[PDB]
Swiss-Prot record:
Functions as a recycling factor of the spliceosome, a machinery that forms on each precursor-messenger RNA (pre-mRNA) and catalyzes the removal of introns. Chaperones the re-annealing of U4 and U6 snRNAs (small nuclear RNAs) released from previous rounds of splicing, an initial step in reforming the U4/U6-U5 tri-snRNP (small nuclear ribonucleoprotein) that can reassemble into another spliceosome complex; this step involves binding U6 and facilitating the unwinding of the U6 internal stem loop, followed by base-pairing of U6 to U4. This is U4/U6 snRNA-associated-splicing factor PRP24. Present with 672 molecules/cell in log phase SD medium. It is found in: Nucleus. Monomer. Interacts with U6 snRNA SNR6 and the LSM2-8 complex (small nuclear RNA); to chaperone formation of the U4/U6-U5 tri-snRNP (small nuclear ribonucleoprotein) assembly, the protein is displaced from the U4/U6 snRNP once pairing is complete. The chain holds residues 38 to 197 of 444 of the full protein. Residues 5-80, 81-159 form the RRM domain. It comes from Saccharomyces cerevisiae (strain ATCC 204508 / S288c).
């Protein structure tokens, strides 16, 4: 218990748009998932990549030392700013989360649903937000919300490290 299989990028110029980032991550390593975060409320952008490996993370982190059009991008491990739900029903559609994070925060970084088999898999779901200061309050609320007699459970930390 302690691995950094998941990395985050910061700065992200126009010059490192999704198409461009895609070129780089596939030349780093094997990867499960990849996304960017358009954070229109701030100048700098972010992105997130589930390499699912430690050697994957190093291949990303090392790739940081290449400037890209006057905005040197920053690659590191992921920080604890990921909420994830566990005890939750599958009817939490990805759209629903983008509504709910606008309703409590305003802004999110990224939003991952599970895909095991079909839908009826009772796996867990994982969402990243810049909004982490208010997320510390939201956790506390949601960690003992009631829906259909189930206590919901969420966390705001990284469930592998």
């Amino acid at each position: 218990m302690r691995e950094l299989t998941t990395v985050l990028v910061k700065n992200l110029p126009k010059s490192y748009n999704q198409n461009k980032v895609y070129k780089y991550f596939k030349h780093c390593g094997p990867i499960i998932h990849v996304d960017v975060a358009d954070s229109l409320k701030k100048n700098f952008r972010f992105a997130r990549i589930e390499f699912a490996r430690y050697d994957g993370a190093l291949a990303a982190i090392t790739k940081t030392h290449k400037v890209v059009g006057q905005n040197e991008i920053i690659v590191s491990h992921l920080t604890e700013c990921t909420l994830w739900m566990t005890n939750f029903p599958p009817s939490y559609t990805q759209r629903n989360i983008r509504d709910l994070l606008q309703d409590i925060n305003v802004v999110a970084l990224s939003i991952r649903l599970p895909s095991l088999r079909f839908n009826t898999s009772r796996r867990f779901a994982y969402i990243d937000v810049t909004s982490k200061e208010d997320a510390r309050y939201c956790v506390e609320k949601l960690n003992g919300l009631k829906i259909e007699g189930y206590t919901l459970v969420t966390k705001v930390s990284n469930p592998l490290e």
